[PDB]
Ligand binder design. Structure first.
Ligand SMILES: O=C(CCCC[C@@H]1SC[C@@H]2NC(=O)N[C@@H]21)NC1CCN(c2ccncc2)CC1
Ligand SMILES: O=C(CCCC[C@@H]1SC[C@@H]2NC(=O)N[C@@H]21)NC1CCN(c2ccncc2)CC1
Ligand SMILES: O=C(CCCC[C@@H]1SC[C@@H]2NC(=O)N[C@@H]21)NC1CCN(c2ccncc2)CC1
Ligand SMILES: O=C(CCCC[C@@H]1SC[C@@H]2NC(=O)N[C@@H]21)NC1CCN(c2ccncc2)CC1
Lengths: 123, 123, 133, 133
């Protein structure tokens, strides 16, 4: 797998959150996320998908994953999905944008979703 | 599981795309997506997460999932993540916003990501 | 014009007027001949009271292939009654015709400390029509 | 003022000037005393040529707790050289100080047919500084 080895490993973003991921041979992503920010403590299950056969033209590798913010310590009734691309090489990075949706009443639904961007670097 | 039965099943969105999902007992989401739009043909693997213990106060249930747009028929070098909440009842619906990231060169990276909103209804 | 009034572009008359979204917020806009959008916004939701000044831009010469007309506008949520230290931009398109519509997505950013910066921005979607709830 | 010039608010002087994002696009803005944002935009990327009019709004009385100052602005991508039938809104905050910054997210919506409506909108993030590349 071209990027299997490149994607799999331990990453950290600009907040200092940590993203431990394994890129499967079938395109699957699995691992754990630990947020340095928000209503989060310890590690949360993640799962996702990546393009296991990216273009050979210098293109990044598209990928995405979801965390639901429930674990054995806390439940923030929320989920974040990161959508981005892996860029291999010198400085491998995963450049993402994300959508954090909280469970709300219908009167509060208009304000359910935060949006942001995380840049990940490896170890 | 409160919403296990509610979330699991076959959903269709406003474009007529179909979202077949199984809500796991551990918070996992799995299934297949078939897009009525874009560079997509037939079904694509999805995986995601949902809050398996949502608030009892009339709140929706937060959830998210990823499709990488590679299957046996086509590869669009792209991934969509849907971020939203399930709202049970009369009219069960899953109200989402999504981020579609394509693999790009670094000169084209500024325009890598589309954003939209899909509303799903069951069968 | 032939009757003596001024000649309106396309979307000038269509966009200009009073609009309502699914929250029941009120969007009073005047589309300028130069591409300017001006007016007021009254939100039915959130930390908002009375009317807020808005300004924006729209494509005053849109494609003639059936496509909508692109536009956008900003409200900063400060007026003489309230300051929510935040601003919303709507980006969308106008779709003319029988039931005219403005279909938008929006980005609401709040002023924050650097430590709360990751959570500065809300995202959503509003559909506007000229029919009142 | 004491020397005879006009008294600038906070962010009035800080925001007003010439800015550059990581693409090397050029953002020339004047922050009005009334909360108005006006100026021009020259994009180094995409279907754009020369300068585009912009308008927006900013919080002219921001919190005094160290938080940034919220703002937003629209460009419709039509000028006398090019029409990309599309409009970008930036939503973000101004962070004053040693290296002042404007940290934004943006929504670029194109006019589309209803069948291409699902793909109307691009999303991204630009950081602006007053230092040129
Ligand atoms: O704080 C968390 C869980 C931790 C999120 C951490 C985020 S993930 C993207 C970013 N990258 C990181 O590395 N860390 C941050 N969850 C909700 C709870 C309730 N919230 C809302 C929001 C809007 N409406 C209603 C309620 C606010 C956030
Ligand atoms: O079309 C697809 C795959 C099918 C996506 C279907 C989408 S999922 C959200 C929405 N809800 C649905 O039910 N269906 C649609 N993928 C890319 C290919 C290259 N694209 C870009 C975009 C920006 N920059 C570069 C390249 C455009 C889209
Ligand atoms: O509520 C308002 C002002 C009114 C917004 C009304 C919104 S405009 C899009 C939608 N369409 C409408 O018609 N009406 C609603 N402003 C902030 C300030 C504090 N907020 C945050 C969020 C994140 N971090 C820090 C602070 C949350 C909300
Ligand atoms: O390229 C431009 C105009 C220039 C935008 C420049 C952008 S502003 C945010 C970013 N920051 C900058 O400094 N520069 C860039 N416009 C459209 C028209 C056609 N497009 C679509 C997309 C989706 N559906 C249909 C058509 C793609 C691009």
């Amino acid at each position: 797998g071209r990027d299997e080895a490149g994607i799999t490993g331990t990453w950290y973003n600009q907040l200092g959150s940590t993203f431990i991921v394994t890129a499967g041979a079938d395109g699957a992503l699995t691992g754990t996320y630990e947020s340095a920010a928000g209503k989060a403590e310890s590690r949360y299950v993640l799962t996702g998908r990546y393009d296991s056969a990216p273009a050979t033209d210098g293109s990044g590798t598209a990928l995405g994953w979801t965390v639901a913010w429930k674990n054995n310590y806390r439940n923030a009734h929320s989920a974040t999905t990161w959508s981005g691309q892996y860029v291999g090489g010198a400085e491998a990075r995963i450049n993402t944008q994300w959508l954090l949706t909280a469970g709300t009443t219908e009167a509060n639904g208009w304000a359910s979703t935060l949006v942001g961007h995380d840049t990940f670097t490896k170890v």
